[PDB]
Design a protein around this ligand. Structure first.
Ligand SMILES: CO[C@@H]1O[C@H](CO)[C@H](O)[C@H](OC(=O)c2ccc(C)cc2)[C@@H]1OC(=O)c1ccc(Cl)cc1[N+](=O)[O-]
Ligand SMILES: [Cl-]
Ligand SMILES: [Cl-]
Length: 138
């Protein structure tokens, strides 16, 4: 397993047609997972499965600019399960990030950070055993 939290450099930032694939297994009794696509200290796209927010499972998505979180976008479809292997695929499209989990479309997140080629790192954190993290151009 890779060491979490894990930084995946994205050389030259992201660009449409770039596919990021994360393979891992959720720990037992998980509380949270996070993917943070970063532009220096800013978070262009925060993808945050929460296993217990007032006894509900929810994925929260947001952007952090100058240390300030913005308006959350929330998804009640929740494909993750404590103890089970998952695949997250993040495809950069021209107007949004498109996210699929276990080969099923989950959500899309409109680009708030516009300088895509400056989103140069992906942080992977939370209650997972991380198997692999990679990218390819499709
Ligand atoms: C309002 O709360 C914030 O919302 C943001 C999204 O809008 C982030 O998700 C923040 O989290 C972190 O930036 C962050 C959190 C932990 C670390 C180890 C590093 C960074 C934080 O979320 C929680 O604290 C939170 C609030 C309620 C619940 Cl139930 C779960 C979470 N959470 O997953 O941390
Ligand atoms: Cl590692
Ligand atoms: Cl920008």
């Amino acid at each position: 397993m890779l060491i979490v939290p894990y930084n995946l450099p994205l050389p030259g930032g992201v660009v449409p047609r770039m596919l990021i694939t994360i393979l891992g297994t959720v720990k037992p009794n998980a509380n949270r997972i996070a993917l943070d696509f970063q532009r220096g200290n800013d978070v262009a796209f925060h993808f945050n499965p929460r296993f217990n927010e007032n006894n509900r499972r929810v994925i929260v998505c947001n952007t952090k600019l100058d240390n300030n979180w913005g308006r959350e976008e929330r998804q009640s479809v929740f494909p993750f399960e404590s103890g089970k292997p998952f695949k997250i695929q993040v495809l950069v499209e021209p107007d949004h990030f498109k996210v699929a989990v276990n080969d099923a479309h989950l959500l899309q997140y409109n680009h708030r950070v516009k300088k895509l080629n400056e989103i140069s790192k992906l942080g992977i954190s939370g209650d997972i055993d991380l198997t692999s993290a990679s990218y390819t151009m499709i």
